[PDB]
């Protein structure tokens with residue numbers, strides 16, 4: 001039985017449904033930053049491909065990552081959905097953003113195809129955290 | 134004109150062709166570790182989705198990442214090709230491996246759909262390295 005804190009806004013998501021099916025014990029809180037907290041250091045920010053693209057368009061992505069890093073020593077970003085075929089932005093803009101966050105800011109960016117996969121990632125990371133704590 | 138060192142085995146790849154089209158000046162060397170060296174600290178390991186899966190099956194992925202980290206302070210892994218629909222392995226095995234490399238080992242894992250995209254990533258990172266050096 002792994003324990004994960006979930007931000008109130010994610011409560012009725014399909015991610016939460018899968019986490020519950022996986023046996024995760026969820027504690028609800030309204031977080032200023034982050035969507036799923038695994039430990040005092042590990043926090044996960046769930047972001048749809050569309051919202052990632054929008055944050056690049058509006059130039060707010062880096063402020064977002066900064067806020068995550070300042071709140072957690074080991075933040076993780078799970079980008080959910082395909083980033084391909086999503087016009088309104090040159091591929092280099094998306095690639096450049098990804099490279100900046102992962103290599104410069106040092107914040108891992110794990111890609112998920114569905115909310116279920118996002119839950120599976122949260123679950124496996126939380127399980128490792130529990131076993132290693 | 135950005136400069137990148139490329140391992141001899143990558144010389145006739147489509148990645149090298151695109152890098153040359155992008156104006157990158159390549160110096161060929163036979164590297165013990167890594168495929169493309171951007172700086173004394175930044176090195177890139179190009180790995181096909183199939184080879185990543187195989188390394189998980191044979192349990193050699195972590196040794197590979199260890200070798201990269203010991204050779205470069207800021208290594209990067211570019212996984213080229215789709216990891217979905219590639220049976221012979223449960224999705225959790227791939228997810229778990231990705232999470233371990235990016236979160237535990239702290240080695241960024243950038244996903245590329247083609248050798249051309251891999252070149253575009255190498256190029257943009259190398260350009261930033263040059264501008265910031």
Ligand SMILES: [Ca+2]
Nearest residue numbers: 035045046047
């Ligand atoms: Ca979110």
Ligand SMILES: [Ca+2]
Nearest residue numbers: 168178179180
């Ligand atoms: Ca390689």
